[PDB]
Amino acid sequence: KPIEIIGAPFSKGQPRGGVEKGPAALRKAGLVEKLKETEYNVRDHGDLAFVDVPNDSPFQIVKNPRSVGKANEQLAAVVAETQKNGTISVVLGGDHSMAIGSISGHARVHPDLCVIWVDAHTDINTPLTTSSGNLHGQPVAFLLKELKGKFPDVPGFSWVTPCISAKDIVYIGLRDVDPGEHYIIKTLGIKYFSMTEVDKLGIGKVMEETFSYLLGRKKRPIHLSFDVDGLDPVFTPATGTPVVGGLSYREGLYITEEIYKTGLLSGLDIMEVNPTLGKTPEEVTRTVNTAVALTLSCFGTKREGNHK
Amino acid sequence: KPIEIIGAPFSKGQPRGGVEKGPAALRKAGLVEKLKETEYNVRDHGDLAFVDVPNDSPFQIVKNPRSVGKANEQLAAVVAETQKNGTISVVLGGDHSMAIGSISGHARVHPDLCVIWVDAHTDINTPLTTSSGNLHGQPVAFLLKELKGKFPDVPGFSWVTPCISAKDIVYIGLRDVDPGEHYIIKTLGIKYFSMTEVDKLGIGKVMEETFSYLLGRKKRPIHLSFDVDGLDPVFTPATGTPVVGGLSYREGLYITEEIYKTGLLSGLDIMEVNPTLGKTPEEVTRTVNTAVALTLSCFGTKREGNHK
Amino acid sequence: KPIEIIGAPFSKGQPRGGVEKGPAALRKAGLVEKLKETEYNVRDHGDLAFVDVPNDSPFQIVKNPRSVGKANEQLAAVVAETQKNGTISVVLGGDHSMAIGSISGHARVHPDLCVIWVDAHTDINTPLTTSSGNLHGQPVAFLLKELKGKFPDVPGFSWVTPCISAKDIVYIGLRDVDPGEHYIIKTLGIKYFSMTEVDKLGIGKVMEETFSYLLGRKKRPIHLSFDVDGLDPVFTPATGTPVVGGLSYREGLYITEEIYKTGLLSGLDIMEVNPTLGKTPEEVTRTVNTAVALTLSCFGTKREGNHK
Ligand SMILES: N[C@@H](CCCC[B-](O)(O)O)C(=O)O
Ligand SMILES: N[C@@H](CCCC[B-](O)(O)O)C(=O)O
Ligand SMILES: N[C@@H](CCCC[B-](O)(O)O)C(=O)O
Ligand SMILES: [Mn+2]
Ligand SMILES: [Mn+2]
Ligand SMILES: [Mn+2]
Ligand SMILES: [Mn+2]
Ligand SMILES: [Mn+2]
Ligand SMILES: [Mn+2]
């Protein structure tokens, strides 16, 4: 099972344009060369060229609906094709709104997959609950089957078909959830481990419980959508929405080390790295290097050591 | 059950006068407005005006005995009256010597209460074991029934009646205990979770064990006396006696989140915040904002989210 | 059982000469005076004068073989003599290559001892697997019986007799292991708790499992070889080989507190403190003071408190 890197220099899901530079910074930090040192064969598809939409007026409060909808449609097609060829897709983020296209294309080939979402946020607001209008905080709402028809058709997304049910996803790291989003996860009964649960259980028990919950019945493809702000700002300061009291460096690596050990990783998203948001040049280097270490961990690099 | 904020701008229990500004900084950080966003009805009694004692010579080694004794007598009366009216009392600290008055007035209405003491110190020296003479490190000694008659009558405190027995209190966070204090907790058998126990058990098991220990037999009123130096100096740097290796931000919030969930919180003390002790202006803002987050957590704010 | 401090100002096991100053900095921080405040009787043997070898050409890739071999032979004799007199030996580090002499002399008197190695590294490369040639990363290879005859005779070490078998040692804190070293620990089946295991289990369960593993059958002498880089660079920045994601201050103290409680500590090594490697003067003070706190903990100082 080879790996295929796919760049997604997109920032229309939020207001800060620098996340577009995420892919470049990750590559410049030597991401591809290091992955070639693993047991996997690596392939770089390159970066995608997203067709911008000039006249893109807000749908109600939702900003850049048509541009976000089209870029995600392009991504889904690309991901589905590589999945169709028996390869693991690695999407280099880009604001988190690109998860719509990443997960959608994945589910086209592997309809039985489950999703592990590492983030300080649930990203499940709907076009009607959102207060900001930024689509990087609404991706999960377009993918959940239970939310289908809970909000008006948004321009640019008629191509989307809800592909995951409430019981197929698990959140880890939550600590900044909007009132509407909380009502939704409680009502629909979505499984989550907020920082409170990580403190209570310990990251060891957290990973054990997420795997038995999702892989109890039968085994199946895993899709890990990693938002860099899942970790505390001390570790990943260069992000658009940092929240204090997050996961540690050690905990972030433990999550990815356990996911590698299942042998079921099928799709990966590394999102929200913004290289123009450091407080200093090293805060940037710190964030980019951590994202690279997490990616390598998903593919075999272990803290105990490695040998051929 | 409404809440009643009570300010206690007092600093005679120790040498640094800046703790008197604790209440003002907490209010300026928006403490009251935010509490009004919870499910509780809020009431601000205001700050107390403590009658200073001009001729206040040291009783042996004990400094400002009469001024500390009178200010606490005034506080007890105020707290007992609001408790008498079915309200939860919130005392805005002030050096920790004000816990004598806070707990005393509380026990007048709820004699069956238990005490959870979060601190790096036990604050249980007696007028005869103390080496500094500062009363903010002796409050527990005036409240324990087992210590009654273990030291000479101190001027200004003849109004005090020991209201709690050794089995009714639990310490969390200890890491700077004097030899005399250690002899006392071992001899009397007082329950505690020092940093060693938190490391061994994890904060999850620590809260589980403190609740079964205190609320095993029957349910009853809870009094949480929180000393801001319970958390590591990296989180709450603006305090008079910082000790390395303390509780994390996450652990501090876990403690308060669990106490809220019991539905038994009856009295609260937020102590030792000194706004004139930062190394920088942000070290101050960091400490004040953390104290506010802890207070809000005691009244319902959860990291998983909230909705009406 | 009295204690005997033994200084080892040596740096030929690696390239940076400043570790030679480790002993002096530790003593200047008041190490001996504080140990005299414990229940043990303290004795300072002083620092050793190591006979340098002028013509010391590299054995293959191994640097300073004869100088490292002789200094360790001198140390072993000194340690064995104090052990012979019923005293606990405390070796003030010095690069970690001095563990060869420390452990060797100890095993001469207590052949049944076990070893607890706290380090970010396994220090088990052989003269043939090493890529740097620095002997401070090869001490364990000269002491393991299973590795005897696995590499050519190195000049200066013909006096060494492998004294410990693979089942007699436990590693804690690993996070920077070379491919050759990993092949060795997996093949020989050596017990270890890398950072992954500490994250999964918690330091409490880690200490419980290392004690049952080593002291399950019968009780016996414990030798703790502590490399200061076992803790994260935020706590012990003044070291030659710092690695991110290490043990916390709290975890380091928990390890030593548990070792004291067994009553089986027989030999101690405090290594790799280099007072000329801070980024600032306080990074140095931070590292030296932490090493002193760890040493005091091994001999009775507890975070819960102490009294006579
Ligand atoms: N819920 C907030 C924040 C969204 C956070 C988006 B994220 O997790 O992708 O960075 C909003 O909807 O604007
Ligand atoms: N035990 C020391 C320190 C007291 C700490 C007081 B506290 O916890 O209220 O800040 C003393 O009695 O002087
Ligand atoms: N394995 C690397 C690093 C050795 C680390 C040595 B130590 O743990 O004593 O600081 C080397 O052999 O050069
Ligand atoms: Mn986020
Ligand atoms: Mn996100
Ligand atoms: Mn205190
Ligand atoms: Mn206190
Ligand atoms: Mn090391
Ligand atoms: Mn070492």
The end-to-end CA distance of chain C, in Å, is 18
Q: Ligand 1 pocket test: pick from A241, A269, A274 the residue with the most ligand atoms within 8 Å of its Cβ.
A: A241
Q: Are strands B169-172 and B114-118 parallel, antiparallel or unpaired?
A: parallel
The count of residues in chain B is 308
Method: X-ray
Q: In what order do the strands lie in the sheet with A191-193?
A: A42-47, A3-7, A88-92, A265-271, A222-227, A114-118, A169-172, A191-193
How many other CB atoms sit within 10 Å of the CB of residue C141?
26
Determine the Cα–Cα distance for residues A259 and C201; give it in Å rounded to an integer.
Answer: 17
Sequence-distant (6+) residues with CB within 8 A of A274 are: A16, A18, A19, A21, A22, A238, A239, A240
Determine the Cα–Cα distance for residues A35 and A297; give it in Å rounded to an integer.
Answer: 10
Sequence-distant (6+) residues with CB within 8 A of C227 are: C96, C117, C118, C119, C120, C121, C123, C271, C272
Determine the Cα–Cα distance for residues A146 and A140; give it in Å rounded to an integer.
Answer: 11
Q: In what order do the strands lie in the sheet with C114-118?
A: C42-47, C3-7, C88-92, C265-271, C222-227, C114-118, C169-172, C191-193
Using alpha carbons only, what angle is made at residue C153 by residues C55 and C122, rounded to the nearest 5 degrees?
A: 100
Give the CA radius of gyration of chain B.
Answer: 18
Among residues B4, B119, B251, B257, the one annotated as catalytic is B119
A215 SS3 class: helix
Q: Nearest residue on chain B to A193, judged by CA atoms?
A: B304
The sign of the dihedral angle between the CA atoms of C203, C205, C206, C212 is positive
C182 is in an annotated binding site: no
Q: Do A303 and C196 touch (CB under 8 A)?
A: yes
C242 SS3 class: coil
Output the CA–CA distances (angstroms, integers) from residue A180 to A147, A249, B307, in the order listed. Answer: 13, 30, 7
Q: Which residue has the tokens 């601000």?
A: B44
Q: Do B254 and A199 touch (CB under 8 A)?
A: yes
Q: Which residue has the tokens 């200066």?
A: C156
For C15, half-sphere exposure in the C-beta direction (CA atoms, 13 angstrom radius) is 4
Determine the Cα–Cα distance for residues B26 and B272; give it in Å rounded to an integer.
Answer: 12
Across the interface, of C183, C199, C202, the residue whose CB is closest to A307 is: C183
The sign of the dihedral angle between the CA atoms of C66, C177, C96, C208 is negative
How many other CB atoms sit within 10 Å of the CB of residue C101?
32
The sign of the dihedral angle between the CA atoms of C14, C16, C19, C20 is positive
Across the interface, of A251, A253, A306, the residue whose CB is closest to C182 is: A306
Convert A90-125 into a string of H (helix), E (strand) and C (coil): EEECCCHHHHHHHHHHHHHHCCCCEEEEECCCCCCC
CA-closest candidate to residue C83, choices C294, C272, C265: C265
For C272, half-sphere exposure in the C-beta direction (CA atoms, 13 angstrom radius) is 27
Structure tokens at C104: 């060797």
**Where does residue C57 rank: exposed (0-12), middle (13-18), buried (19+ CB within 10 A)?**
exposed
User: What is the identity of the amino acid at C307?
Assistant: H
Sequence-distant (6+) residues with CB within 8 A of C261 are: none
Structure tokens at B76: 């007890």
Determine the Cα–Cα distance for residues C80 and C109; give it in Å rounded to an integer.
Answer: 6
Output the CA–CA distances (angstroms, integers) from residue A137 to A98, A100, A189, B116, in the order listed. Answer: 11, 11, 19, 39
Q: Whose CA is nearest to atom 5 of ligand 1?
A: A137
CA-closest candidate to residue A76, choices A22, A142, A18: A142
CA-closest candidate to residue B66, choices B155, B190, B175: B155
A43 SS3 class: strand
Convert chain B into a string of H (helix), E (strand) and C (coil): CCEEEEECCCCCCCCCHHHHHHHHHHHHCCHHHHHCCCCCCEEEEEECCCCCCCCCCCECCECCHHHHHHHHHHHHHHHHHHHHCCCEEEEECCCHHHHHHHHHHHHHHCCCCEEEEECCCCCCCCCCCCCCCCHHHCHHHHHEHHHCCCCCCCCCCCCCCCCECHHHEEEECCCCCCHHHHHHHHHHCCEEECHHHHHHHCHHHHHHHHHHHHHCCCCCCEEEEEEHHHECCCCCCCCCCCCCCCECHHHHHHHHHHHHHHCCEEEEEEECCCCCCCCCHHHHHHHHHHHHHHHHHHCCCCCCCCCC
> How far B197 CA sits from the closest chain C CA (Å)?
9
A170 SS3 class: strand
DSSP class of A37:
T
Name every protein residue with a CB atom under 6 angstroms from any ligand 3 atom. Answer: C 96, 119, 121, 123, 125, 130, 132, 134, 136-137, 178, 227, 229, 241, 272
Q: Does B177 touch chain C (CB under 8 A)?
A: yes
Q: Does B249 touch chain A (CB under 8 A)?
A: yes
Closest atom of ligand 1 to A134 CA is 13
Determine the Cα–Cα distance for residues C103 and C84; give it in Å rounded to an integer.
Answer: 14
User: Rounded to the nearest whole angstrom, what is the distance from the C-alpha of residue B229 to the centroid of ligand 7?
Assistant: 8
Cα A78 to chain centroid, rounded: 17
Active-site residue flag, C258: no
Q: Cis peptide before C230, with omega less than 30 degrees from 0?
A: no
- Touching subunits of C (3+ CB pairs, under 8 Å) are A, B
Across the interface, of C249, C302, C304, the residue whose CB is closest to B245 is: C249
Contact C243, C194 (CB under 8 A): no
Contact C239, C229 (CB under 8 A): yes
B17 is in an annotated binding site: no
CA-closest candidate to residue A123, choices A68, A171, A194, A70: A171
Find chain B residues with C-beta within 8 A of A200's C-beta: 203-204, 254
Task: Bin A6: left if φ > 0, else alpha if -120 < ψ < 50, else beta.
Answer: beta
Listed by start position, the domains of chain C span 1-308
Across the interface, of C202, C249, C254, the residue whose CB is closest to B196 is: C254
Among residues A136, A168, A251, A269, the one annotated as catalytic is A136
The count of residues in chain A is 308
Find chain B residues with C-beta within 8 A of A177's C-beta: 304-305
Among residues A73, A181, A229, A258, the one annotated as catalytic is A229
Q: Ligand 3 pocket test: pick from C97, C229, C231, C241 the residue with the most ligand atoms within 8 Å of its Cβ.
A: C241
Q: Does A261 touch chain C (CB under 8 A)?
A: no
Q: Do B305 and A192 touch (CB under 8 A)?
A: no
Determine the Cα–Cα distance for residues A116 and A214; give it in Å rounded to an integer.
Answer: 9
Contact B259, B38 (CB under 8 A): no
Output the CA–CA distances (angstroms, integers) from residue C14 to B66, C10, C17, C138, C274, in the order listed. Answer: 64, 9, 8, 11, 12
- Touching subunits of A (3+ CB pairs, under 8 Å) are B, C
Closest atom of ligand 3 to C120 CA is 8
Output the CA–CA distances (angstroms, integers) from residue A67 to A25, A96, A217, B81, in the order listed. Answer: 24, 14, 39, 62
Cα C59 to chain centroid, rounded: 24
Q: In what order do the strands lie in the sheet with B265-271?
A: B42-47, B3-7, B88-92, B265-271, B222-227, B114-118, B169-172, B191-193
Contact C140, C115 (CB under 8 A): no
Q: Do A196 and B303 touch (CB under 8 A)?
A: yes
Active-site residue flag, C153: no
CATH number of A1-308: 3.40.800.10
Contact A116, A224 (CB under 8 A): yes
Output the CA–CA distances (angstroms, integers) from residue B12 to B68, B70, B90, B97, B263, in the order listed. Answer: 6, 11, 20, 8, 34
Q: Are strands C222-227 and C265-271 parallel, antiparallel or unpaired?
A: parallel
Closest atom of ligand 2 to B178 CA is 1
C123 is in an annotated binding site: yes
Active-site residue flag, C136: yes
Determine the Cα–Cα distance for residues C103 and C141; give it in Å rounded to an integer.
Answer: 12
Determine the Cα–Cα distance for residues A289 and C24; give it in Å rounded to an integer.
Answer: 37
C78 SS3 class: helix
The alpha helices in chain A, defined as continuous H runs, are 22-28, 31-35, 65-84, 99-109, 139-143, 179-188, 195-201, 203-215, 249-262, 281-298
Determine the Cα–Cα distance for residues C113 and C118; give it in Å rounded to an integer.
Answer: 16
Determine the Cα–Cα distance for residues A241 and A257; give it in Å rounded to an integer.
Answer: 25
Cα A22 to chain centroid, rounded: 13
Sequence-distant (6+) residues with CB within 8 A of C181 are: A305, C122, C124, C125, C129
**Virtual torsion, Cα A224, A228, A229, A235, nearest 10 deg:** 130
User: What is the identity of the amino acid at A122?
Assistant: T
C233 SS3 class: coil
User: Rounded to the nearest whole angstrom, what is the distance from the C-alpha of residue A125 to the centroid of ligand 4?
Assistant: 13
Across the interface, of B250, B253, B307, the residue whose CB is closest to A179 is: B307
**Where does residue B43 rank: exposed (0-12), middle (13-18), buried (19+ CB within 10 A)?**
middle
Across the B/C interface, how many CB contacts are shorter than 8 Å?
A: 53
Sequence-distant (6+) residues with CB within 8 A of B162 are: B142, B143, B144, B145, B147, B148
User: Rounded to the nearest whole angstrom, what is the distance from the C-alpha of residue B106 to the centroid of ligand 6?
Assistant: 21
Name every protein residue with a CB atom under 6 angstroms from any ligand 1 atom. Answer: A 96, 119, 121, 123, 125, 130, 132, 134, 136-137, 178, 227, 229, 241, 272
